[PDB]
Amino acid sequence: DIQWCFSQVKGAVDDDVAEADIISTVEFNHSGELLATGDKGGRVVIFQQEQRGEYNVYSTFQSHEPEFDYLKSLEIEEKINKIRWLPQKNAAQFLLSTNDKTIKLWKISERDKRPEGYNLKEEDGRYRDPTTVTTLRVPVFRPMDLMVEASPRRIFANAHTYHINSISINSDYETYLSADDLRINLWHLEITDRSFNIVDIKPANMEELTEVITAAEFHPNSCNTFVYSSSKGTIRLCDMRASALCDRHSKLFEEPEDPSNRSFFSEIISSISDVKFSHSGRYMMTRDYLSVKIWDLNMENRPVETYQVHEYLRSKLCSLYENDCIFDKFECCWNGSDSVVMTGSYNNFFRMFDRNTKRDITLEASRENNKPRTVLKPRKVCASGKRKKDEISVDSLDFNKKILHTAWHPKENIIAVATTNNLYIFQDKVN
Amino acid sequence: DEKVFTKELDQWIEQLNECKQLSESQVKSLCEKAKEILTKESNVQEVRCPVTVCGDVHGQFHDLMELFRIGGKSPDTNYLFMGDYVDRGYYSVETVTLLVALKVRYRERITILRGNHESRQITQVYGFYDECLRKYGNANVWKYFTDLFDYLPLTALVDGQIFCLHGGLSPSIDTLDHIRALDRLQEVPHEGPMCDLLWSDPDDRGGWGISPRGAGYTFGQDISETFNHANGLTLVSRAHQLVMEGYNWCHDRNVVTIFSAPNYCYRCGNQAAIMELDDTLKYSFLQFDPAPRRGEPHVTRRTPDYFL
Amino acid sequence: LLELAKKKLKELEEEEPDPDLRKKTLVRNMIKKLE
Amino acid sequence: SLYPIAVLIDELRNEDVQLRLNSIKKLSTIALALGVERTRSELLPFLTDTIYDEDEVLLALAEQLGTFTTLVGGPEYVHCLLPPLESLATVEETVVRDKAVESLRAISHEHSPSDLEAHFVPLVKRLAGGDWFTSRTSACGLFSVCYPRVSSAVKAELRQYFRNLCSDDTPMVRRAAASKLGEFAKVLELDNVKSEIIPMFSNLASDEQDSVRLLAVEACVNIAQLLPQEDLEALVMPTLRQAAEDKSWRVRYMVADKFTELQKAVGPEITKTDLVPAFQNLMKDCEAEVRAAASHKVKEFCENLSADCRENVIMSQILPCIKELVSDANQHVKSALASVIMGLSPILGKDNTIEHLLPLFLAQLKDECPEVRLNIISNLDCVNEVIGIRQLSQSLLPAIVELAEDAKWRVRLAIIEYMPLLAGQLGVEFFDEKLNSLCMAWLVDHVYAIREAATSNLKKLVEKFGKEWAHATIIPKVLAMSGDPNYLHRMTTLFCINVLSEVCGQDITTKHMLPTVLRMAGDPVANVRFNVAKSLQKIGPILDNSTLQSEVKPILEKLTQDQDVDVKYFAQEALTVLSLA
């Protein structure tokens, strides 16, 4: 087990943070350097890795703005739901981002050149006589200090009647998708007026509503495979070759429901929250409210691995219904080599399992016990009343510090864990 | 001379045919002429039959041009409107500008009334202010158009037999001298007979009722036929309420609801009828589906060029 | 547990101005499955 | 004297997008005024790397730099435009890169062989060996301009660089290579083509993406048009056969859309021997776009088949597929097939036409979907000139009569537009003995656009029937149409008079129709008074003083006293239209 070692922390210290400080996504980039954290309000904040180094701030830019609807006249919001990066075309780096209605395509670039030379004005702009000029001069270029600056290039807007909860760049540098609660449009990264509705599961009339779409991905190697999830437990595996309209599945991954543990909430703790392909293109881990569960792409009718995250909650499941703590969209991320998997949990713990040795840990991202380069020792929660000095009685977990969003450096062994108002960046001890 | 002004306005009409953006001085002069024409008119504009009646448009330009094609080109066929030229729409500015231009060019062959959504707070909140901010970037146009709205006649008496208004009726109204007693140079109120007149809707529910909109009232049939008998009226045309069928007969055929905006709010996909006052006062409807939008819809099941 | 008839108060006294339909669809398909 | 130029040279440094755009466009005057031994060293180094990111500024700058072959100093210093264009060839945008590449190609012709090999080939190699996947995408299009004029070693190096590009990682580079494959191959030695481009074509037509495999089809078309016909069965044909049975429907659609050109390239023998089965498979495809595309080329394909067995093959292989497609479930397929089914009639001799083409025709006409009847009707000329429509008129009549009356006036407008051709192709007595009833209803139709179309079609007919037929047919009906209550129907008679006077002649108009018009002048509706003024204004140019001063002038004088303003204005307009100044 890689013993993890505290490395950094962002955000403030006072626990009265306003609503526009709750981190709402965390996403590294393809090569590893940058790290975007788009909290509520829109204020994307990009961290660059110091050329291991620590992460220091690179740019900052209000991405979205509090809008207002015309027809439904709604309080169309400004949260940042997803932040996906694009590959590297030149010395600039691009990244989509979305609130519940829009999708912008920002662009972050450095600049160290300033025009130096004027014709009709002085160095301060104070203009001289119009006619006294005798020899024209052309501005020259001379160095200045790095001034990183973001700016939107396109805005894909007004195509989703419902809220947006996914995007994914297609594996061919050209297109991507964006899956609202009931449809899936396939945009194009250079055409900001047309879309192509590729899936629709909206019924004829609304009142007979059964399921919705709670996630959508693509395939990291194939150009014609998305995996849009479903709010009942099923996972379609669409295929954009056999027919232009991909409404009919080419597979359907569905657990053959177990009648043993059937309970009262047997449909609300079994609704997928995030499906994530596996960095090679074979497995497709998904995370419902109580167990990450690693499907396989060649065996539909059953998963091949099942890891229980916080099993000590299947009793309190009743009490978890009156405080709306049972609708929580947890999120899971893979290792760089498809051997370890991580997912968030309550009370700031974040479980990270291990595929090849079947071990598991439970660390704790907190402040008042950790210093740089120390080690995080496994916290072990106890379900019973027998509690001895190194376990927490489940009657004491604070059900208001949820580690929803997490990431994992592509190649190296650095992770970023985003609690309510901080961004701990625990790495491991380089020896 | 008026000839040069008319030729310049015709050239601007052809320019509008080209869908060209306008400058400020043109709209200011047009507004000044409109106000000069309108200050002499009272609350009850006298429209002489025959005429083509149309209800809400809510700034949908394409539906308006389609209406123009179906009903003929002005001034060959007379036209009339019943308010709701703003709110819940994308192209209010073009609608109002073309309306004012055609009105100035053909003062006496076209009439335009005012609607409940022609109120300062309502227009400011419902798109129009944002639309002006996007197209000019300043609120001067908003002030000009609100000034023009103030002078707009409230009701229209067609040939002394048919009465047409946008909103509805009011308990305190029994005869038109009440409407002619109002001072149309004011902001749309929240209470009073005029508000209920502009903010009411028919009530199929028996007797009186409380308007769910929170402003106005729900006139019953009793007052309607009492008004008709007192003033010798047959029908009372109206608009401002959405109907999936374009027009409906309610209150024992006493009320005909006209809607000229297919797919009001672009969601309901309704029909749109225009109840033409024939030469002999009969009612004819020419229903038209939502106008085919050019290069639309953006979202289609059909494969686009880049994908094919 | 079986007493969810009272906890139905959530979807009872709610006035959703079109928020996401996952939370509404869950508590709306939750009671009809039993009542 | 240089004040405006002094303003303009500093105006490309402001913050207004329009100001910078205008300065960029006018850069020509600044360059001309600065000189020629100063432009290269002062202005170009300033435009080398600009921080303008607007698509409308960089595009204009590239297009302007593309036309600086003279100001820079002449064809001897043209290599001074490379530093400022290589920096635009590698920008994040796409249209900017395309324009920069086009300008680079355009200015490449001004170099000299030694100058080329010294300063331009290094640019290509560099861009095609760069680091970003935009330098390579832009470089993948400068080989077809610098291959012909270079030496042998440079030629081999360029071939190696292209072969390296065709095996790149980023699908964008491979897409660019697949796009430029044919354009590059069109300048290679034939033996070198056979031995070097073919492996590239195969490796790009068996790709793992599909945005590359779909462009491999166009590459195949060009390559086939290049090579002789003794090797198509061993070099190109296997790849085309594989593509015609691909798995991604985009590739099959691309093959279907490029079938006439594919046939013209492969030749008649290979066409007849192999392509026909592929065409049948394309028609019987499970998709919908593939079927529509394959149907669109039913006529162009059958028209280019070998004359030896055209009729046999058509009737033995292709006819059943069309027969099945006629009753298809999709709409686009049926519409596309209907729009071109008329080209098959003149390929048989009208005997096979009557024997098997007729049924399909009736099925299409009887179809309850719109635009299918419109397409089938609009091209009737074929059978008319092959079977003699007089024979089929007995079947045409029910379809035309049922299509003339519908709900939406859109179909009513498209068929009224198509009416004049059929009217001309049908006859005189047949038309008058039958579709005359229809004509009358058309004028009193509700939607006004249909009234316009009916009036225009009347005009077209009376211009094709001249005077006597009109005088013996419509004259009384249109004249009596002036009693309807709805003023619109009387105005319709007014426009009909206006459109028909110039075709019926003043000897009859003024003698019979005019007095009615003068009666209409006194309508109790202003909408008609000014219409009758406009009509008088329109017939004046063919009216003389003898009748003008006798009847017209009193009428305009009376109209000028009306209460309405428009009536007076239009009467005055007429008064002046009489060329009186």
Numbering used by the authors:
A (entry chain B): 9 to 59, 68 to 447
B (entry chain C): 2 to 309
C (entry chain D): 1 to 35
D (entry chain A): 9 to 589
Question: What do the authors of the reporting publication say about this deposited model?
Answer:
PP2A is a major S/T phosphatase in the cell and is generally assembled as a trimeric enzyme composed of a 65 kD structural subunit (A), a 36 kD catalytic subunit (C), and a regulatory subunit (B) of varying sizes. The A and C subunits interact to form the dimeric core enzyme, which only gains its full activity, subcellular localization, and substrate specificity after interacting with one of the many regulatory B subunits to form the trimeric holoenzyme. Instead, PP2A depends on its B subunit to recognize and bind to specific sequence motifs that are often distal from the phosphosite but help to position the phosphosite in the active site of the catalytic C subunit of the PP2A heterotrimer. We have previously shown that Eya3 recruits PP2A–B55α to dephosphorylate pT58 on Myc, increasing Myc stability and enhancing primary tumor growth of triple-negative breast cancer (TNBC).
Kruse et al. have used protein engineering to design peptides that bind the proposed substrate binding surface of B55 and identified one of the peptides, B55i, as a strong binder of PP2A–B55α that inhibits its interaction with substrates. We next incubated the PP2A–B55 complex purified from HEK293 FreeStyle cells with the B55i peptide and determined its cryo-EM structure to an overall resolution of 3.5 Å. The C-terminal tail of the C subunit is clearly visible, and its conformation and interactions are similar to that in the PP2A–B55 + Eya3 complex. The structure also shows that B55i forms a helix–turn–helix structure, as predicted by Kruse et al.. Density for the C-terminal helix of B55i (residues 21–32) is well defined, but the density for the N-terminal helix is much weaker. Although the main chain of the N-terminal helix can be modeled, the side-chain conformations are less defined (other than K10), and the density for the connecting loop between the N- and C-terminal helices is even weaker. B55i binds to a similar surface as the Eya3 peptide, mostly contacting blades 3 and 4 of the β-propeller and the α1 and α2 helices positioned above blade 5 on the B55 surface. In particular, K10B55i forms a salt bridge with D340B55 and a hydrogen bond with the carbonyl oxygen of Y337B55. Residue K23B55i forms a hydrogen bond with D340B55, and its aliphatic chain forms hydrophobic interactions with F343B55. Residue R28B55i forms a hydrogen bond with E223B55.
